[PDB]
Ligand binder design. Structure first.
Ligand SMILES: N[C@@H](CC(=O)O)C(=O)O
Ligand SMILES: N[C@@H](CC(=O)O)C(=O)O
Ligand SMILES: N[C@@H](CC(=O)O)C(=O)O
Ligand SMILES: N[C@@H](CC(=O)O)C(=O)O
Lengths: 324, 324, 324, 324
């Protein structure tokens, strides 16, 4: 059997409420990893699992300094001969951010699978137990190697680069509308469909081993009447990058243009992304900043933060956006 | 034949580029309304059309003061016995905002149909001509009355309350993943599928006749490491409301909580929405602010602005979010 | 509390397998209704429920003669003052057919909610418990009246007319891509979004009280090299109608045209539907047969069977396809 | 510039109607290939194109014997040093069948791109011109090599293995809900997202050079009351295989089981697929026949026909269903 480490960070998957139908007033990140494992003893037929408690928080409180430590820990684990893969239990709300960070920074082809749940462990029809079992199956399969970081929920295997939480509250929320899933798990069998045609993991140039902090990057929304003062505030607080969750294809109002030009004059890198949820922001030399390709704003922030650890050259940063 | 006014505001539908494949370096909002009409002379078999040029701008520059005028003009037009419906040509980037504004403020059951195009008029396979023809068909059909404000592109009829631009750059971008379309136009025939179960138009309390400006509302994004200083900036600039494009189901970090509590102390109304793109943000009294129900951040901003013209009572505002 | 009858027919919701991960070799339709109710005692806080065992079969074996009796029983129940609504447990494979049959033949505005499960009751993270509780919530809410027959799974409320099983094996399979959901159930609260703009239930002309069988209707697939001999076989076995699950928009090969013309010469009514999964098959007088509007093949069969209890007139039948 | 052959077979892309809004009463496959080319002279900046007229038919009339000749011709063309790629203009209705056939039988890494249109060439906002330009762009890019056969419409590049016509009548009908697109074409640039994780073209065992006909395979639908006599008819007419477009996950009624057992006793190979549109049909040794994995019925028929040119062995055929 493969040796899988379950590295727990918190989330609703580790939530415990007073009744089976209670959806508020409980902490998302209360139960320990061994309680998760022991609720699905079937996992022991799939792998030799060892639980490690990395943190226990709601993912809306996950921070880059913590995700950096997570990446460093996972790199240490996967460097061991006695670790075949890692499953990371996490909150759903920012799992796409943490997962994409590890996608770019983990220097191994051994699987790294993020798993989460939309219902707490105490819920009627809780999804966490099956999601964890699926995640372990994926992490221990030798066919799962070399595929980049994955996010597994609801019988689907999503690439960290494409997968996003698309719905505030449903079990099927994690989708990649234009890129689909890497694979699916049906009837206790994994079906791989796609390999992502982007750089990642052992083919990624990003390395943050030995870093202890990351560049500051903020995200500003685009909308009718969007204000220039938010750009001024970000600049004043020393951001190194701004990701613009733009109207349409990174379109920018007269006010946003003024903000962006100010930022660029102070050496801030601006990435024009989109608030729409999907698709390509194409190059446009008449507008300020760089473009995000198909990265959504949350992902774009992660790639920009990592880019800024190793370059300040806009040409190189733009090329990263087209290749990672 | 029905008498339809085509009220033009700009957009890529009125864009004109130097070649058939050029997608940048042209102004979205350059062609006049009569050029659009004359490019589809078939529209004169469907309706007696009259063009009126309201504005000619890219929709990323549309502002609430201008949308207020638009609403007022459309009400004047629909008050006339010689006007059976209005088609509004507009940019795709913010059409959802303008349309939802009119959905709540137009005091007639006569059809109001927004139309737009993802490719400029000069493009190969431009979508504007057929979109405009479909929109005119919709606006003139007696079966279209009483349905709320509609957005028509790509053979689909979307409710202004549910429809959003979901993709930065595709023709099929306008979708309502959970709510579907009101109807479709296939083979020159309209097929109505749904009526929205929300208040609108003639049953809406919002009336902005005579107003000349609207309450200031900004939108802030939720993400890992989201900073409190953006709340401080918005407060300092005198916002009346803040819409939060939250992680997951309006989930809030410790920093966002501190920001939101500060804003609420100053009398700012905070609405928690979602950055995910779809779904319900459920109530949670322990978190700050009101919740957006299934309104996305752009729509939630429009409803909040209108709500604040009538009330500062949280109970009443929250009920608007559940019913409009 | 509302009085709700849970009328059980079988399905995977009532399936019981030897382990938590076994997905084959168990009978869908083994557990009794009271075992379903007793697994979710929370239901007794939502309604006064009474279980009735109508049948216990896998839904692939559900037949029109049995669905007729199901409709007749439901009508009997809803005619009672002591019944406020009904939930029908059923297999997922043909629930859309049974549900649409009841949608057209149930003469009450009281809610009728079909419910099902993709994983058996014994499965890890079984969906049936929560699906049943959601269904009971929907059936007992006074806001649910007059909406037509509903299908409830995975926090979604779908209209019987639009909802279909879109995926062979996932929990989120029931979707209506173009029409959306009537509503959703999130955080123990129902959010109604739409009302279907079609005839149903109390406004439907179809009445089958007193019938003991239905007219025979088969479905033939369209594809490259589709054979004429399948039309001959159907005609020889006495079908009254044929639904063609056509290529594209009910397109027909030379072979299919010959088969259809032969069928129509014998008095068979032919409906051209689509194998695609969605959309409108538009009228085309140059092709044989009537068109299915947006009814998929399984639904189109149900409507044709019901139509043939009332009329043989093509004009009238075609109008049913456009209104039901 | 690359040298691209445009091999025309017909379809609505080659349709010509009397007015810009006419959607019936015109032949789909009337215009010649040069007339398509001459409508988009921009193509000359992308490639040196040569048109060749293979056929001119509606795709509902495409037959396996003709697709076999199409595959043979494409193989001849791509064996030439002066051909870099091939674009095939085709009807939308069965493009997925012809494309998947070529995906398994074309013995080259040079791109083969099928292209089609939902609106005829004479239509207002006809999609064919831009679809053809995109297809030529894809066929001529050196990055497009080795990706398997592609289907290009509406700015999307779909794998022939996953893409299907999902809507009877809309421009955006070609989707792969679970597998996404291989890439997209926005702003005159190709963005590759995925590589399919299945065998195709140069790695495929299927070679039909020298064949003039193929094994007979029919498709039978699954539904309530599905009749055994259709199996008897297929058997009597000498089918070598039957693809069952099953209820749910290839579920079979008692009648279908009896039919399938009869077919198998006569040496017919039975593949259980799904009518649902998407997803995996899992193995189940208690049911008759082989399973289609995620192939939909139309694709399953194509694979089974090709498999039968080589083997009758169920173990090998089942493996093909899991790897092609
Ligand atoms: N707020 C929770 C939500 C979840 O996990 O479903 C979290 O992200 O930690
Ligand atoms: N920027 C343009 C884009 C479009 O209309 O497609 C607009 O919103 O005005
Ligand atoms: N074959 C089962 C499948 C399910 O219910 O999920 C049924 O329809 O009865
Ligand atoms: N019946 C046409 C439809 C199209 O091309 O859109 C064909 O398949 O040939």
């Amino acid at each position: 059997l493969p040796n899988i480490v379950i590295l727990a960070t918190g989330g609703t998957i580790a939530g415990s409420a007073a009744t089976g139908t209670q959806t508020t007033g409980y902490k998302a990140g209360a139960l320990g990893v061994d309680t998760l494992i022991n609720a699905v003893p079937e996992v022991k037929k799939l792998a030799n699992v060892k639980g490690e408690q990395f943190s226990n928080m709601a993912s809306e409180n996950m921070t880059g300094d913590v995700v950096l430590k997570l990446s460093q820990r996972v790199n240490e684990l996967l460097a061991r001969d006695d670790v075949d893969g890692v499953v990371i239990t996490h909150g759903t709300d920012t799992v796409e951010e943490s997962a994409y960070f590890l996608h770019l920074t983990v220097k191994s082809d051994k699987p790294v699978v993020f798993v989460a749940a939309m219902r707490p462990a105490t819920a009627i029809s809780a999804d966490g137990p099956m999601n964890l079992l699926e995640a372990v199956r994926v992490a221990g399969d030798k066919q799962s190697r070399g595929r980049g970081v994955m996010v597994v929920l609801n019988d689907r295997i999503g690439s960290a680069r494409y997968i996003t939480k698309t719905n505030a509250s449903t079990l099927d929320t994690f989708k990649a509308n234009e890129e689909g899933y890497l694979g699916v798990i049906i009837g206790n069998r994994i079906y791989y469909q796609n390999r992502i045609d982007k750089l990642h993991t052992t083919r990624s140039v990003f390395d943050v081993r030995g870093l202890t902090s990351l560049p500051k990057v903020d995200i500003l929304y685009g909308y009718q009447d969007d204000p220039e003062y938010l750009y001024d505030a970000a600049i004043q607080h020393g951001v190194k990058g701004i990701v613009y969750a733009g109207m349409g294809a990174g379109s920018v109002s007269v006010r946003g243009i003024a903000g962006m030009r100010k930022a660029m004059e102070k050496g801030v890198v601006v990435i024009r992304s989109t608030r729409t949820g999907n698709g390509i922001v194409p190059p446009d030399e008449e507008l300020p900043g760089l473009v995000s390709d198909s990265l959504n704003p949350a992902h774009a922030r992660i790639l920009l933060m990592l880019a800024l650890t190793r370059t300040s050259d806009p040409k190189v940063i733009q090329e990263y956006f087209h290749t990672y």
